[PDB]
Design a protein around this ligand. Structure first.
Ligand SMILES: CS(=O)(=O)NC1CCCC1
Ligand SMILES: [Zn+2]
Ligand SMILES: [Zn+2]
Length: 581
């Protein structure tokens, strides 16, 4: 408790000594509360006018238009301690999994140089004054002296400045210095691809949306039961102190300074947290707790993948009858669990696709469906089903939800097979119509529109409305203007290369599931979904609104070209049969 967090709490007190006060009307039940002080401040979603002017039929579709308009009683809940048998299964599994992930990888520190390069190319590092932006702090030796002071404090096993700022979501911003120290110690998990499919067997880190359907189809080829895709209710809030101790065992594979710097992140910032929260009644609350997930988003992704892989292997063990009860593992159940892992562990990992809190599992058989005691006792309670009701599985890989998508098998006129990503088209159009942040020029707004258009051409070319809208936006934005994003899966659409050349490289040349490497010479060789399937997944094909939009698209393109002004444009519409004379 307060020996580890006191220094941080002490330092904050003094900077607001004029305002400090132990409030009595504090709303916290499960957070430890320490004091309050005076503040006064809050970024809503803005519309992208280039994309909206070129998607007129969607102006009257509420699922699209409502997306642009506008639980913290889950952060203030508690998770019970797992039983002794559960804690044993988790420790054995976690020990075994870090060894497997570490067989072909070497833990190592990430560098100031590496951190500086990621800040100077727009990452979402989630930092918060003294310098304007992160770009400025990073080019100033004063910052690195602050970093140095905290760094030596961490080697000494103590913390002064690593404090969270709060804002079914929750993003915990720290100052850039704290982020550096986190990245220095644990950045290797992402930077060296510990959760790649080749390294982790269950993982999909660095797999583009163009690979995920092929991966699910490969899992479907295994003998076994249904495919299960159970979502957890509020994964980050169900991370237990036992979970955080099993994650910290990655430090057992480290040495020297690195080992000590990583041990300090886990001990001082993850297993003990200090957070500042805006309360309207406007004070700042300084609260603490030991458990739940609060790390940078990239480290959170890798540790969520780790703990999800562990939890799903244990649910598979329960279904296969490896252990009888979570109350207590006998001496010989421990050896049975260890022996299962050594004997079939890697095969069972290959039966899963795991992306942080999101999973798909094809178990050995459907006993998995009702194997719920370990999963419930680890606190990974399933969303939108009663605690003890058996899971409903999927009989067809093309129906399974994963990473907010489903996947279609699409046969090209020439016989080759594409496995393509898909989601309801209202969600895709409604997201492309939204920007984040202030001070967008017309050129910057146009370049963000172009980024969405090129993603659609690469991932969603099979949706009639999106191929047409993508061609229209690319015709409306100057040909040489570079696609942009403010928060940056692989992003092959972020380029000024011709999109047909990029399509060929992604779907044909570099596609390990495509044996025939014959290049496609035109967009007309590239197929669509069936017309009825396109409607099922939200197409407006068949509506009068959509027909008038498609017929008159050159008028929409010319409206946007007139706003942007006298620039160099390319007509991409004749790449589609109906505008090709
Ligand atoms: C703090 S983190 O390791 O989760 N994220 C990094 C911060 C800078 C680049 C990514
Ligand atoms: Zn610290
Ligand atoms: Zn679909």
């Amino acid at each position: 408790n307060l020996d580890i967090i006191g220094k941080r709490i002490e330092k904050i007190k003094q900077e607001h000594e004029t305002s400090w006060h132990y409030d009595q009307d504090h709303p916290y039940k499960t957070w430890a509360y320490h004091g309050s002080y005076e503040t006064k401040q809050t970024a809503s979603s803005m519309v992208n006018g280039v994309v909206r002017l070129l998607t007129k039929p969607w102006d009257i579709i509420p699922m699209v238009t409502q997306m642009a308009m506008t639980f913290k009683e889950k952060v203030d809940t508690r998770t019970q301690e797992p039983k002794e048998g559960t804690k044993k299964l988790m420790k054995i599994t976690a020990e075994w999994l870090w060894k497997e992930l570490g067989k072909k990888k070497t833990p190592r520190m990430c560098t100031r140089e590496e951190f500086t390069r990621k800040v100077r190319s727009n990452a979402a590092l989630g930092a918060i004054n003294k310098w304007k932006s992160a770009r400025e702090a990073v080019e100033d030796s004063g910052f690195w002296e602050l970093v140095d002071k905290e760094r030596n404090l961490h080697l000494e096993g103590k913390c002064e400045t690593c404090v969270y700022n709060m804002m079914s979501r929750a993003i915990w911003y720290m100052w850039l210095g704290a982020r550096f120290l986190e990245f220095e110690a644990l950045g290797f998990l992402n930077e060296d691809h510990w959760f790649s499919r080749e390294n982790s067997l269950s993982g999909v880190e660095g797999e583009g949306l163009h690979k995920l359907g092929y991966i699910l189809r490969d899992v479907s080829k295994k003998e076994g039961g249904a495919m299960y895709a159970d979502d957890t209710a509020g994964w980050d809030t169900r991370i237990t102190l036992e979970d955080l101790k099993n994650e910290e065992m990655v430090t057992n594979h480290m040495e020297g300074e690195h080992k000590k710097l990583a041990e300090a992140i886990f001990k001082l910032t993850y297993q003990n947290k200090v957070v500042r929260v805006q309360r309207p009644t406007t004070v700042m609350d300084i609260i603490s707790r030991r458990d739940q997930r609060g790390s940078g988003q990239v480290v959170t992704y890798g540790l969520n993948t780790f703990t999800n892989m562990e939890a799903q292997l244990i649910r598979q063990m329960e279904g296969e009858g490896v252990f009888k009860s979570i109350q207590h593992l006998t001496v010989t159940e421990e050896i049975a669990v260890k022996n299962w892992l050594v004997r079939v562990g890697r095969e069972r990992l290959s039966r899963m696709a795991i992306s942080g809190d999101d999973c798909v599992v094809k178990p050995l058989d459907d006993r998995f469906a009702s194997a719920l005691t370990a999963l419930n006792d680890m606190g990974k309670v399933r969303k939108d089903i009663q605690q003890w009701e058996p899971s409903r599985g999927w009989n067809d890989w093309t129906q399974v939800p994963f990473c907010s998508h489903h996947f279609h098998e699409l046969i090209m006129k020439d016989g080759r097979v594409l496995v393509v990503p898909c989601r309801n088209q209202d969600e895709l159009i409604g997201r492309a119509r939204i920007s984040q942040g202030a001070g967008w020029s017309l050129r910057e707004t146009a370049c963000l529109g172009k980024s969405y258009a090129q993603m659609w051409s690469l991932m969603y070319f099979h949706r009639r409305d999106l191929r047409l809208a993508a061609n229209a936006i690319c015709s409306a934005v100057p040909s040489h203007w570079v696609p942009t994003s403010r928060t940056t899966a692989t992003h092959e659409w972020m380029t000024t290369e011709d999109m047909l050349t990029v399509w060929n490289r992604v779907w044909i040349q570099e596609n390990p599931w495509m044996e025939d490497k014959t290049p496609v010479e035109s967009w007309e060789e590239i197929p669509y979904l069936g017309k009825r399937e396109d409607q099922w997944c939200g197409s407006l094909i068949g509506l009068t609104s959509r027909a008038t939009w498609a017929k008159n698209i050159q008028t929409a393109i010319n409206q946007v070209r007139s706003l942007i002004g006298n620039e160099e444009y390319t007509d991409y519409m004749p790449s589609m049969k109906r505008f090709r004379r």
